[PDB]
Design a protein around this ligand. Structure first.
Ligand SMILES: Nc1ncnc2c1ncn2[C@@H]1O[C@H](COP(=O)(O)OP(=O)(O)NP(=O)(O)O)[C@@H](O)[C@H]1O
Lengths: 269, 50
């Protein structure tokens, strides 16, 4: 592919290394997003290896709830990623606009998330930064995991890297322990709470107080939450990684079953 | 902004695409890609013959 295979429509957003454009591939008139990255900026920042790893991971995943990277190409100055267009845009914007999601919307997102994450884990990919800002939304509002920045393929070894986002950090990262794929189970629980409440569960005035709340699992449920939703969150936000509810458990949880209105997109044929 | 990319023509084309998915695996996934280790190296132009 080259840039002249596409009609450029309009900017969708400014990334750190270039813009993302709404584009239409000329030959099939197929609408996609083209993410443009400047090679010199990437090299200056020293992110080449990180970018390679992110592309290597995202470009080999095929799931309805993971944003697809169809292909990629480069020219003299730019690297171009050909991505699935998410017509309903950023999840975080929707949550901010509404303040909190209702149970139906939240359960639906949870089922989609757990399915995408299970797909990942079956391939020994750990995501490591699930939060609303890393999620986009499809035509029917389907969750799409979009940012694989912190992800890793971890076939054998446990990991040590502190990664993710303050409010979402699992206790084991804060304590300097090794971690595994169960980090994603914890983050799923933080996400479910934020969806329903509109604030993450360990919100605090300082980074040290947030860490303290996390490692103590100082979870205080607002009285408006349903017993089912509290049950799921409680089962994900376990101090001990091995005790967290598995992703198949999230999919099977009664609150998810009773409230989710998940619909699988049409597929070719 | 070209017309295809705004308001209604866009809305309409997105709907159309959701319900008539293309064989992306074939249409994009069989097409060659640059090696990852070559992304930061020399871009060679598409055409060179004499
Ligand atoms: N596939 C997409 N479909 C629709 N909008 C997109 C898509 N990808 C990116 N965008 C929009 O483009 C914006 C910036 O792109 P993104 O890849 O997120 O960079 P960012 O969010 O600024 N983070 P980074 O690129 O890491 O700085 C996003 O916030 C979206 O609003």
């Amino acid at each position: 592919f080259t840039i002249d295979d596409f009609d450029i429509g309009r900017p969708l957003g400014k990334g750190k290394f270039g813009n993302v454009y709404l584009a239409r591939e000329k030959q099939n008139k197929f609408i996609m997003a083209l993410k443009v990255l400047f090679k010199s900026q990437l090299e200056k920042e020293g992110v080449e290896h990180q970018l390679r790893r992110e592309i290597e991971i995202q470009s080999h995943l095929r799931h309805p709830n993971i944003l697809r990277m169809y292909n990629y190409f480069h020219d003299r100055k730019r690297i171009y990623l050909m991505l699935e267009f998410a017509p309903r845009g950023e999840l975080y914007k929707e949550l901010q606009k509404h303040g909190r999601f209702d149970e139906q919307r939240s359960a639906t997102f949870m089922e989609e998330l757990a399915d995408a994450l299970h797909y990942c884990h079956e391939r020994k990919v750990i995501h490591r930064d699930i939060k609303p800002e890393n999620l986009l939304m499809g035509y029917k509002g389907e969750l799409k995991i979009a940012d694989f920045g912190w992800s890793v393929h971890a076939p054998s070894l446990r990991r040590r890297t502190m990664c993710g986002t303050l409010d979402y950090l699992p206790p084991e990262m804060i304590e300097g322990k090794t971690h595994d794929e169960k980090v994603d189970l914890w983050c799923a629980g933080v996400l479910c709470y934020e969806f329903l409440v509109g604030m993450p569960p360990f919100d605090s005035p300082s980074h040290t107080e947030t860490h303290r709340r996390i490692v103590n699992v100082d979870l205080k449920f607002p009285p408006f939450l349903s017993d089912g939703s509290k049950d799921l969150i409680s089962k994900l936000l376990r101090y001990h990684p091995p005790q967290r509810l598995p992703l198949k458990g999230v999919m099977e949880h009664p609150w998810v079953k009773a409230n989710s209105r998940r619909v699988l997109p049409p597929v070719y044929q | 902004i070209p017309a295809w990319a705004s308001g209604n023509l866009l809305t309409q084309a997105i709907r159309q695409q959701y319900y008539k998915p293309i064989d992306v695996d074939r249409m994009y996934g069989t097409i060659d890609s640059p090696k990852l280790e070559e992304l930061f190296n020399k871009s060679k132009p598409r055409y060179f013959k004499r």
